[PDB]
Amino acid sequence: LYVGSKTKEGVVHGVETVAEKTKEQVTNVGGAVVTGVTAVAQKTVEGAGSIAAATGFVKKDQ
Amino acid sequence: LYVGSKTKEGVVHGVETVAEKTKEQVTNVGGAVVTGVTAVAQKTVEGAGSIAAATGFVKKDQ
Amino acid sequence: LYVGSKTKEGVVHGVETVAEKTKEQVTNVGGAVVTGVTAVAQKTVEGAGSIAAATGFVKKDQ
Secondary structure, three states: OOOOOOOOOOEEEEEEEEEOOOOOOEEOOOOEEEOOOEEOOOOEEOOOOOEEEEEEEEEOOO | OOOOOOOOOOEEEEEEEEEOOOOOOEEOOOOEEEEOOEEOOOOEEOOOOOEEEEEEEEEOOO | OOOOOOOOOOEEOOEEEEEOOOOOOEEOOOOEEEEOOEEOOOOEEOOOOOEEEEEEEEEOOO
16 A cells, blocks of 8 residues: 555445334344344455454354 | 645445335344345454444354 | 545445334244344454344254
8 A cells, every 4th residue: 555545445334224123023042033234344354264343143053 | 644735544425315115014033134224334443353344143153 | 445436336325215014023933034124234244154144044954
């Protein structure tokens, strides 16, 4: 990187949400339920077998 | 990278959502349910067998 | 990269959503259900067997 300016490296911007989600009922046993706004702003992830920004994520392997 | 400016490297911008999702009922046992806004802003991911930005993700291998 | 400016490297922009999805009922056991807005902004992914931006993703191999 050098004199170059206005670097807009990963940005989550201008997220607006309006929700009238009335009368909800979430039920499970061993599962994953994700609701609502979610944002990540990673820039560099390294490593073999590395998991980044996992939502609604399930692992049951050996 | 050099003098070149206005670099717009990965950006999630202008996400607007309006939801009137009334009378919901989510049910499971070992599954994954994802609802709502989700955004990621990764730039560099390295590594063999690396998982990035996984939603509604299921693994049951050996 | 050099003096060249206004680099618009991967951007998710201007995402608008209006939803009146009333009277919903999601049910499963080991499956994946994804609902709602989802956006990713990766730029570089490297690695053999690497999974990027997986939604509604299922793995049951050996």
